[PDB]
Amino acid sequence: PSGVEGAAFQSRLPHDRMTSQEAACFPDIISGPQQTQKVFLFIRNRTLQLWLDNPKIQLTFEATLQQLEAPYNSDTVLVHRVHSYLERHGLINFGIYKRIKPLPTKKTGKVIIIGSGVSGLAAARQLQSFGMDVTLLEARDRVGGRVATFRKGNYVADLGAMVVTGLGGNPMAVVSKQVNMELAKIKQKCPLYEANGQAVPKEKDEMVEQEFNRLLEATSYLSHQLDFNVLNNKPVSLGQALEVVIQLQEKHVKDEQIEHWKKIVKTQEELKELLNKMVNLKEKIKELHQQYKEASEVKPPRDITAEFLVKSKHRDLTALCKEYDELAETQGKLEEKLQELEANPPSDVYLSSRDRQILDWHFANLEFANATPLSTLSLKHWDQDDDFEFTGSHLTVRNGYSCVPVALAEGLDIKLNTAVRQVRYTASGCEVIAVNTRSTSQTFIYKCDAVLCTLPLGVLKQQPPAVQFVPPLPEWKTSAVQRMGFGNLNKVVLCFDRVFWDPSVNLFGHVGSTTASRGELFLFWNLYKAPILLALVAGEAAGIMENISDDVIVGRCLAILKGIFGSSAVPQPKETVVSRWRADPWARGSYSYVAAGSSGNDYDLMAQPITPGPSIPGAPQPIPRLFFAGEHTIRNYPATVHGALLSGLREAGRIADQFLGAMYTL
């Protein structure tokens, strides 16, 4: 899209309508006359445009109103409310801009941010930008969280986030104009290679893929038209519903085979009953011929009855010879109706062992995408966020993604090697208790008006807790934590001295032998400028290979690559790295998924702040104190970096509205 309407689209906003968030700050306008809405919407889209066209420098209200024209520049408070809503909620002046009016000299309010993943960093930058004292507590000795980036010599390779999923409407677009990121498009072509080491032939490839996507439509139709969402009091997972669909596709291969052969029997038995009428005229004729012959043995002259006997047996015998001739016709039809049906046999199988194993690779792809076995995914809801997909090519960050968290960390009080242990929030403030990860003994105490928690969902899930909430989190929050899924996927990075692969396909599949291994080393990535190949361990495999050495793992890697490229075209890798995200105690997993039994609404539960009870009984209701951000908190963009970043911006605007007040609602 283009113009001011493109700025609304690149801010994930409808250009022609007011969002629920805007109705909240501008209820005057949304209940007001359509013309003011159109005015409002224009200042909205125009200011977004202004910011978007130059995201490297702060967009002051002065600069905004300066470039507004009548009729719109005629109301300066509307333009001030709009610009301040936009700025408060991270739609403008987010990220890494040159601040025009340098930072307020003295700060207001103190925020503790747990974790410096991208969500934490995104809030900290906004909160500080808003004049608050923000400091971040980070258990690792680095920022980024699950944006991990291997670097050695000229080798770079992301073991966490790795792909910008398209720039259309993507906040990572703005960040990339603000930050050197080598964004390289990722080319669609992905050839699959069976366990033998040899291409799936275009023929199969395109049948299996299409049958896969038809199976997905089916599960969707099962869920949404047939309401097939509980079975034996448990919620149907996607993996289950795919089985029920395949089995009904196998029941139907047989159902149709059974009716086709039941058509051969219906005709092999009309032919039976007819070859019986015909065996019974060839003998009613065998004897009328005897009789006619004997009647002809009488030599003339014959009395008239003996003449009639010859004549009558003759008329009789040709009548039956018409009959037996009229049946060898009808015998000639049914005899051909049969290798009509015998020559058009219905489908023999639904899918062969070779088909299923390719259909497995598409399931390993859904298991990668959700970082979990399909048996855990919600059937109804696993893809509940598809409407929000960005447009455009996916991209890779050729200089390593870590380059982004690092850039975002610039300018910020970050305490590395500080492991939060207890979060204590009360009606009057919060204290966060943390230890130093090197010598646990060193104990730290941070007091603050509010804590922004960006702990990974897998951390929040630990039994027994890595982090104690005092007072404990209310049930509604802990249930959302226990309902929601936190998946797992891992990465094997292979560093060679030579490019032994197709240097112009970015990615290629490997088809696994068993269903049980469908995830193991199923996809390879050629993304980087040095000879680096990157392999994925998805599905149930991910959980398994964590208990297997690097060597056994890089072994199975080189095996695949040998089998696929030539035992001898595949050198030894000069460096190898295997991720283990479920074992990483600051992740405890990779990213979240809509578990069977969960919905996208659990994501919203996760983002609701906590309000502590009153200290003094009978005292007015507090202020909320415990805020949550992070990938697992953003329903419309889960499991991603951009979703994490967006959730940081969300909380920063929500905290600041709380503790700095929202002057832009009147």
Binding site: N213, R214, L216, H362, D386
Partner: peptide, 16 residues
């Protein structure tokens, strides 16, 4: 979720 998919992006069940 499905939005994560780069290789061989699935399509069934997705609104076209």
């Amino acid at each position: 979720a499905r939005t994560m998919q780069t290789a061989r992006k699935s399509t069934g069940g997705k609104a076209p």
